[PDB]
Amino acid sequence: AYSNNSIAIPTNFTISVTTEILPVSMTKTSVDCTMYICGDSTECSNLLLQYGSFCTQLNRALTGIAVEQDKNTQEVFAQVKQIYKTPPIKDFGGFNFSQILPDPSKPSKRSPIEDLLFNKVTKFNGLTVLPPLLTDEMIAQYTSALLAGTITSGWTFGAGPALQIPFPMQMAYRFNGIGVTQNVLYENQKLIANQFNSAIGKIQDSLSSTPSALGKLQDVVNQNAQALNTLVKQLSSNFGAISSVLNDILSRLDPPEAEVQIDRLITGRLQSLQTYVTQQLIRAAEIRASANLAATKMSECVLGQSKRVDFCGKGYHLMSFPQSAPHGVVFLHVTYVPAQEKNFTTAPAICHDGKAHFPREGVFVSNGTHWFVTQRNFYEPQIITTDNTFVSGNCDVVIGIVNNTVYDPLQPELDS
């Protein structure tokens, strides 16, 4: 209901917790070329050495892919110089982080949500799988250090030395960052803490309910596995030869025609290897782009408060917390949303004594009988004084001016 002198101002707020899931790394694999092309045969290698340094090309590509995966993980996670730890005391003014802090009770040091994610996510032909440089415990410790630093030091630990600060004061910092005064939090702390705990419980329940949300990670694994299986299947085709088994054709026919058969087989298997390598390269490029996006999100959403719209979750952004997952990172974004709106009449200025008064920070609102000044994201009327407004100009240039009286706090004191 648009109109030239009507606004809507919220009167209540909701704290929401959303999730975002990003793949980071892909399984590192390396395939022996000669062993794949042929198994326990000298004639294969003697006929193959005519093809040059293709094997070196394949091995270089795969090694580069693996090193890039390691670099992706290291760039995404290792962003803190120290390794902090939360104090054993659990007094945060009402907030409850039991669902995200590490649990010493479990044999593996992980938060309950990390274990929920880990339990929701599910060879002999020259191909080998190499282990990653960073194990699961290392990234778990990295995430724990990041979370502890975020909880106990705000964002100051991301720029220099870590500085302790009470959690309600950090909350007031973030609220003032999004454009809401500190008194709102300092007076609705209990409600905000209850809403935060409820949202954390809701996100735990929602994640435990269905595993489809994790598909972004899960798909990736399947893809890699498929790209392996099909490759092995290519070892069971004749490629226009007498038989797909090298031993039988070798032991059946004499050199001068077994050689042409072997050449056919080698051509087919080399084409298969080239296809696999190219597919892996393209998929690695895509995964690298995703990992760079995840690193940027971790640097900005977690280590600080982002002013970019719809970058760290829908709505005004308050913070985020990181969690690990197999080949991926899950961000929990904590955001602020206006809840209940009310109608008001509006004027861009006020004429008092032949001069126009403009609001310093806030909007003029009339409830039909009187005029007040509020902020732009939470209804909080105040008497119009000379300190909330500033004077500039006359009463005939602005369009839509209104008549009212501006109170001067100095005058009653002067009279007294």
Partner: protein, 131 residues
């Protein structure tokens, strides 16, 4: 396993055969393909020192000395460490942890110190701090 009386071999992985009926008698034997893997050389700067280490990627150490057909390994040649990444020859084991000088894998990193000149340790994520 248990094979039905009409069955000879089995394909669990669904693309290759890994079990068979015994040719001598009526038992069943499983088949595991013979081991293999890459060989990596871990060295500091060549103009710093000449001592190196050898990492057989993904293979137990009860196997390295006798299969391959050149330099030899010798069991006394080192402590023959056993890592999750494979079999490591030519380096000792140090309980202390430092920064990852050379990436080996599975949280193991190797470095050079002046007793073999090359040591392998579990990587340290950083100096511990509490606020």
């Amino acid at each position: 396993k248990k094979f039905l009386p009409f069955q000879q071999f089995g394909r669990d992985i669904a693309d290759t055969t890994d079990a068979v009926r015994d040719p001598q008698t009526l038992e069943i034997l499983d088949i595991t393909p013979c081991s293999f893997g890459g060989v990596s050389v871990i060295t500091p700067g060549t103009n710093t020192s000449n001592q190196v280490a050898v990492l057989y990627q993904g293979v137990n150490c009860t196997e390295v000395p006798v299969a391959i057909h050149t330099w030899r390994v010798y069991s006394t040649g080192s402590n023959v460490f056993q890592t999750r990444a494979g079999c490591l020859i030519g380096a000792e084991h140090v309980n202390n942890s430092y920064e990852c000088d050379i990436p080996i894998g599975a949280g193991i990193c190797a470095s050079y110190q002046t007793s073999q000149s090359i040591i392998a340790y579990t990587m340290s994520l950083g100096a511990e701090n509490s606020v």
